[PDB]
Design a protein around this ligand. Structure first.
Ligand SMILES: [Mg+2]
Ligand SMILES: [Mg+2]
Ligand SMILES: [Mg+2]
Ligand SMILES: [Mg+2]
Ligand SMILES: [Mg+2]
Ligand SMILES: [Mg+2]
Ligand SMILES: [Mg+2]
Ligand SMILES: [Mg+2]
Ligand SMILES: [Mg+2]
Ligand SMILES: [Mg+2]
Ligand SMILES: [Mg+2]
Ligand SMILES: [Mg+2]
Ligand SMILES: [Mg+2]
Ligand SMILES: [Mg+2]
Ligand SMILES: [Mg+2]
Ligand SMILES: [Mg+2]
Ligand SMILES: [Mg+2]
Ligand SMILES: [Mg+2]
Ligand SMILES: [Mg+2]
Ligand SMILES: [Mg+2]
Ligand SMILES: [Mg+2]
Ligand SMILES: [Mg+2]
Ligand SMILES: [Mg+2]
Ligand SMILES: [Mg+2]
Ligand SMILES: [Mg+2]
Ligand SMILES: [Mg+2]
Ligand SMILES: [Mg+2]
Ligand SMILES: [Mg+2]
Ligand SMILES: [Mg+2]
Ligand SMILES: [Mg+2]
Lengths: 199, 81, 61, 84
RNA sequence: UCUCAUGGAGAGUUCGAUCCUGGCUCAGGAUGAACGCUGGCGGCAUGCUUAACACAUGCAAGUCGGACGGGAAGUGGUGUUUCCAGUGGCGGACGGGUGAGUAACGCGUAAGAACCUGCCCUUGGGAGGGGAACAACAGCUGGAAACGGCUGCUAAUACCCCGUAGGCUGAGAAGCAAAAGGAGGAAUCCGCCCGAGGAGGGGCUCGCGUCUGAUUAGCUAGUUGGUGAGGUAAUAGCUUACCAAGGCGAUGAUCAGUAGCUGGUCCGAGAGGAUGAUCAGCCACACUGGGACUGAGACACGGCCCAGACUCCUACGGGAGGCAGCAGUGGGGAAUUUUCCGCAAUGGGCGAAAGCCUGACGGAGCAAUGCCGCGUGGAGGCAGAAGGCCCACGGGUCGUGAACUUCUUUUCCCGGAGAAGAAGCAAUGACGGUAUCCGGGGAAUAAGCAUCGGCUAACUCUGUGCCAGCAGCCGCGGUAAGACAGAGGAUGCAAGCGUUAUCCGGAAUGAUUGGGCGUAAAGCGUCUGUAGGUGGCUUUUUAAGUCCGCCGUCAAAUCCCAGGGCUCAACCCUGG
């Protein structure tokens, strides 16, 4: 139920994924293989747009396809409502705040009981955090060090408007609902809906 | 005979009952005609609408052992007679 | 009825118990059934790695 | 509306009159109103009815096998013979 | 510039080529699933669709001694007391299981009149006086056994009569009808008899809806209708005698075949199609058939009688039994589970009470059967090397992948702590030292399956040479195979992946919505006309259809919206 594989192997072919890792590829390997690939089919273009969501969030098709049903039930902009469910995931929120260098790295912190929400432990990376929800670490120096090391050993990216940070607890807070234009990944959401038109 | 008892409906090892008036010979999950309460031991919450319950007790409805205890903690018997 | 022997090589002979499934072979008129390899008496295909579940063959180790 | 009218054909039997009832109802697949027919048996102890007459039916306790109605006069009619 | 609308995708194949028409095939989703390869945990559910085939063993309905007589045990063979074979009372018609039969008031929905109803509730009046029996028991006696036979004794909330009556019969006069006592410092509760009501439950009738076939067209004779005499809790040819000749049907009678129905489940843009597992309600059946007793209630799964088939015991004279109850065995079949714990909770029966019983139910165990959720490591990794494959022989790819360095421990191992569920002062927990929490150790315990000719995302090399073989369709292979097999690599899924089977969709391919009949399949050879369908204009009547406003109902669960609770989800709950 997890990738556990190389990531540059897909980034050469797929696109760009700041969520997975801020590192970049090295080599434009060969002009030969680019001549081998050449053009792309329309189904492939809709396919590759879907795969970007499978990596940027660390999600399965079964887990993803469930969210598609919730968006279809929700009225208006089913493509936008989809990202409202993915961006509100706990694994993304702990990442966009900057408490981990990678979303897989953040998923590990959630799994080993290092974070609590509103005074209670949460052992689910797929937890949907509502507006006005507090996110704090535990009291152990091990837990405090991992988040403290993430906020200290490298520069910090500018945060959104819908997220804050109190450096005295090293915590965060969700203000309101995201806008579709504040996604952390260049997306064409309409193509994704066109892919799941059959299902 | 009409009787005031409670049926089970919930998850395994998490009992969540509801009070209801039905015939005795009918099974536990029998056809209902008036639901007149809700109860669980874990959370210990109770709505227990009194105007419907008194309608049956006047007509000869006999509570069970625990439903008698639930109504005993309430003051319905003093207004019933 | 009559069935088809998929795969390469087989040990079946008269008075043997097989297990039949669906599927027809267009090239052979009249044949409308396939047997399962890796069953009561039909053994898996020898020296087969790719598409190994469709013939009832243990994984090498 | 409530009860069923009908024509009183085949009134030969004693203290009884066969009655033909007609109704219209839409077809469920195609939604067209079709004229269906169904017969009944009623009783007139006075024998005040004969073939060619218009009669109304009422529910009552059963008198015999298949005869479970009572013949009465019609309530709402539109004779209106030669009105201005 | 409002709002509504969250919803309809195609592709290949006839030809030398094109436009059409028309079939076949595929991409989707689902399953009571099965098989193949593989396999870490947890949560909620599910688990004989076939032989309604036959069944070893154990259990699944008992209870009251505060209804009665006797008997046994114990004690200080003395009082209290404990146990019960029998008489008597209630329950054994609920609950559980199974869909064989059933095409019709069986089911669903919506109404009715000619009825019953123990236990519960409410209410008006009563219980006076006598007698006779069968059990048990005692004696004798027949049997291999199961079970008896005879002779005598005995109690009762068991039996019988008399007396009384707000009831029954009848036009009336008149005639008839009951009861039981038990416990007790005596207030006095549990009960009994008659009568009138309430609720629930059940019986009966009716409107509407309720599969296929016309190469089944005539069917019925107690059959349709009445009277009289019957009969049922009650209406009814429910039964019978006589009389009348009606009754059903080509809008499908009758006959034949199929099938449990429904809430709902799956698919679908919708209209609608298919379907009736788990859950819930009704009906029906209980080895195959028939019949009745008992009771308020049955024509009774674990009750009785008879016949038939089968199985078991036998001392051969004669007896016993019905898992379509739980678990389990044999057999059939591709295929579906422990001969488990407990009445702690829920519910049911008996009892004044204490308490007894409850294979219902609540739990555990087996299975990846399904749905949901979390892992099988994160970060960094300069340069270079071994190794696999490919090459235009320079290199490229596998590949930041690995090695290596640090960090963490869901899970794993060790050691402690430890519930809620219990309602009822306290005690009362099958599950269970279960969930859950704390501490220590340490990347340590964990990824595979299919595909890579086009539909269809993903490619080369070697080997083979119309061979071996692939394939859902078109079709590939005959010496440079992107279609076979192997290798490397890639793509798509993921503790699952694929194959097969079944239903829907795609399929506008039965075209109400939504097709066509000049030549592609399709206008009777033609005309007259019955039933049937439709029908010019104008003014009125009625309000059946139709439209609007209110009332009742279509259970709950499920679906839809909102809210809440399990660390999230599935899922559970509240409200609408
Ligand atoms: Mg999963
Ligand atoms: Mg051609
Ligand atoms: Mg069966
Ligand atoms: Mg008593
Ligand atoms: Mg006894
Ligand atoms: Mg009784
Ligand atoms: Mg008398
Ligand atoms: Mg008859
Ligand atoms: Mg008559
Ligand atoms: Mg059947
Ligand atoms: Mg359609
Ligand atoms: Mg049998
Ligand atoms: Mg019985
Ligand atoms: Mg039995
Ligand atoms: Mg069984
Ligand atoms: Mg119990
Ligand atoms: Mg109980
Ligand atoms: Mg027992
Ligand atoms: Mg399997
Ligand atoms: Mg790594
Ligand atoms: Mg392609
Ligand atoms: Mg193949
Ligand atoms: Mg070659
Ligand atoms: Mg190949
Ligand atoms: Mg169609
Ligand atoms: Mg056509
Ligand atoms: Mg022609
Ligand atoms: Mg033609
Ligand atoms: Mg004509
Ligand atoms: Mg409902």
């Amino acid at each position: 139920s997890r990738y556990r594989g190389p990531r540059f192997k897909k980034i050469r072919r797929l696109g760009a994924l700041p969520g997975l890792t801020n590192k970049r590829p090295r080599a434009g390997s060969d002009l030969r293989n680019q001549s081998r690939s050449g053009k792309r089919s329309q189904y492939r273009i809709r396919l590759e747009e879907k795969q970007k969501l499978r990596f940027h969030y660390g999600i399965t098709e079964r887990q993803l396809l469930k969210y598609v049903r919730i968006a279809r039930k929700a009225k208006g902009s089913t493509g936008q409502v989809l990202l409202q469910l993915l961006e509100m995931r706990l694994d993304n929120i702990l990442f966009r705040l900057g408490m981990a260098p990678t979303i897989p790295g953040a998923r590990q912190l959630v799994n080993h009981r290092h974070i609590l929400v509103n005074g209670r432990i949460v052992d689910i990376p797929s937890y949907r955090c509502k507006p006005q929800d507090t996110i704090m670490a535990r009291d152990e120096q091990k837990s405090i060090a991992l988040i403290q090391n993430s906020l200290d050993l490298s520069p910090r990216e500018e945060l959104p408007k819908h997220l804050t940070l109190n450096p005295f607890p090293y915590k965060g807070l969700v203000n309101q609902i995201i806008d579709s234009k504040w996604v952390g990944l260049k997306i064409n959401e309409l193509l994704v809906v066109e892919y799941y038109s059959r299902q | 005979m009409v009787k005031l008892r409670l049926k089970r409906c919930g998850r395994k090892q998490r009992a969540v009952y509801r009070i209801v008036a039905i015939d005795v010979r009918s099974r536990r999950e029998g056809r209902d005609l008036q639901k007149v309460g809700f109860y669980d031991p874990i959370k210990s919450q109770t709505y227990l609408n009194v105007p419907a319950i008194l309608d049956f007790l006047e007509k000869g409805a006999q509570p069970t052992e625990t439903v008698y205890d639930i109504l005993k903690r309430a003051e319905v018997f003093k207004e019933f007679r | 009825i009559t069935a088809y022997i998929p795969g390469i090589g087989h040990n079946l002979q008269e008075h043997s118990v097989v297990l039949v499934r669906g599927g027809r072979v267009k090239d052979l008129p009249g044949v409308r059934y396939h047997i399962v390899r890796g069953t009561l008496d039909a053994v898996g295909v020898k020296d087969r790695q790719q598409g190994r579940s469709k013939y009832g063959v243990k994984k090498p180790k | 509306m409530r009860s069923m009218q009908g024509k009183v054909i085949c009134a030969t039997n004693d203290k009884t009159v066969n009655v033909e009832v007609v109704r219209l109802a839409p077809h469920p697949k195609y939604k067209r109103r079709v004229r269906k027919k169904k017969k009944y048996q009623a009783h007139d102890p006075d024998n005040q009815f004969k073939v060619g007459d218009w009669v109304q039916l009422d529910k009552c306790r059963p008198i015999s096998k298949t005869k479970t109605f009572l013949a009465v006069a019609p309530e709402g009619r539109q004779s209106s013979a030669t009105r201005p």
